[PDB]
């Protein structure tokens, strides 16, 4: 390798990062074979991390060789794949998996080291679903240590040097507790991923009306910095518009459309996020 592949969270904060290398250090639980191991000092009194997957095992799905989440968005791989509608055929059984890994490394040897191989580019339409489920700031709780089992029973007699966060241990009844690393990599029943599914299912999106002839769309929360041509340029080449009523006595709008699916495109993509000159409009189908 040249260096690891991991997100900013796993990657660190200080401008000068310190990581030690060992060639052929241990076994990628994916490629199953020896890899290089680079070990990075995450943060002040924060657990030193290490590279935990073959670089090819990484370029396969385009995820973090330490943080394990995708490198573009940073959600569970099950999620990110489905958010691209992506459907990978990676084999599972022992002999099948070894044959797959061998030919995979052969096929990746013909690469230039810039981007993951295969459908990872022909699924690069990062949907606003993924964009919105994407975390914003570095959830740097990751580099805090374990539960110092001594310090959970009382025993951690080393003073403050408990090797692990001497807090209350999580009740493993939580589905967010035991996610086998191999399953999390295979996209195999990640309960955290199902939580992201429930969250991105309950997260607000624009609603559909009943009758097809309701082609009037009310956009609530306009303000008096908007123009009718600006409401147009928001919803104009996204189809054809038939008319628009910019209600200044109520600070809203209403686009009567010329294509129903065009209306759907503009409005559903616009739900609360059509931010032209900074005003939170609400795209709905009018009365």
């Amino acid at each position: 390798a040249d260096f690891p592949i991991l997100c900013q969270t796993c990657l660190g904060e200080n401008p000068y990062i310190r990581m030690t290398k060992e060639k052929y250090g241990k076994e990628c639980k994916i490629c199953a074979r020896p890899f290089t191991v680079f070990r990075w000092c995450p943060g002040v009194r924060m657990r030193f991390k290490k590279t935990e997957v073959c670089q090819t095992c990484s370029k396969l799905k385009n995820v973090c060789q330490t943080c394990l989440l995708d490198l573009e968005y940073g959600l569970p791989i099950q999620v990110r794949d489905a958010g691209l509608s992506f459907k990978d055929d990676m084999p599972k059984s022992d002999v099948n998996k070894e044959y797959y890994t061998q030919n995979m490394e052969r096929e990746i040897s013909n690469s230039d080291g810039t981007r993951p191989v295969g459908m990872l580019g022909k699924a690069t339409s990062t949907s606003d679903m993924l964009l919105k489920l994407a975390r914003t700031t570095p959830y740097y709780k990751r580099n805090r240590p374990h539960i110092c089992s001594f310090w959970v029973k009382g025993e951690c007699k080393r003073g403050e040097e408990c090797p692990y966060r001497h807090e209350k241990p999580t009740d493993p009844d939580d589905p967010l507790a035991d996610q086998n690393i191999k399953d999390r990599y295979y996209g195999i029943n990640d309960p955290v991923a199902d939580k992201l599914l429930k969250r991105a299912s309950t997260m607000p999106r624009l609603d559909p009306p009943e009758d097809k002839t309701i082609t009037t769309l009310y956009v609530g929360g306009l303000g008096d910095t908007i123009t009718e041509t600006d409401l147009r340029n928001h919803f104009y080449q996204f189809g054809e518009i038939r008319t628009i009523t910019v209600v200044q006595r109520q600070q809203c709008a209403f686009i009567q459309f010329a294509t129903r699916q065009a209306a759907e495109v503009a409005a559903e993509k616009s739900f609360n996020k059509l931010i032209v000159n900074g005003r939170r409009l609400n795209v709905k189908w009018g009365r």
Partner: protein, 158 residues
């Protein structure tokens, strides 16, 4: 002097573009006199954005070449109602306005964004299935495609 449909019979197949001088007389004269000049022979498609745009027409083929009939560049001939709303929008693009040179772009789909930044000048009245074929092809990381595609014959309509 407005060559109605200018033929660029490219290597993979023909193209012919009708430019509306009433909408874009200046770059229309540019493209007419330029195709008649034939200095385009050997232009490799300088950008391929699959299903969005096909762009070429540079004697350099890197993205930093190209000169016009007027010097290096001229201003835009901007339109009120002409848009890049669909494939075959033939508009010479700018890296900054009033700097339109030799490189030419040909759309592949609705591109209503570069409207107001590109004077949409006409359409490919020939070769549009071929344009879809071209916009399909595999390009490297730098939009100069892995296929070295150039025009066979550049000339006006009579």
């Amino acid at each position: 002097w407005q060559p109605p449909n200018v033929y660029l019979e490219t290597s993979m197949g023909i193209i012919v573009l009708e430019l509306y001088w009433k909408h874009a007389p200046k770059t229309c004269k540019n493209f007419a006199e330029l195709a008649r000049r034939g200095y385009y022979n050997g232009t490799k498609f300088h950008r391929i954005i699959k299903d969005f745009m096909i762009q070429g027409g540079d004697p350099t083929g890197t993205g930093r070449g190209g000169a016009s009939i007027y010097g290096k560049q001229f201003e835009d001939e901007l339109h009120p109602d002409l848009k890049f709303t669909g494939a075959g929008i033939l508009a010479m693009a700018n890296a900054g306005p009033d700097t339109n040179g030799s490189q030419f772009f040909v759309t592949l789909a609705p591109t209503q964004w570069l409207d107001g930044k590109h004077t949409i000048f006409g359409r490919v009245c020939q070769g549009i299935g071929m344009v879809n074929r071209v916009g399909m092809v595999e390009t490297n990381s730098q939009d100069r495609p892995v296929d070295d595609v150039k025009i066979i014959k550049a000339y006006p309509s009579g």
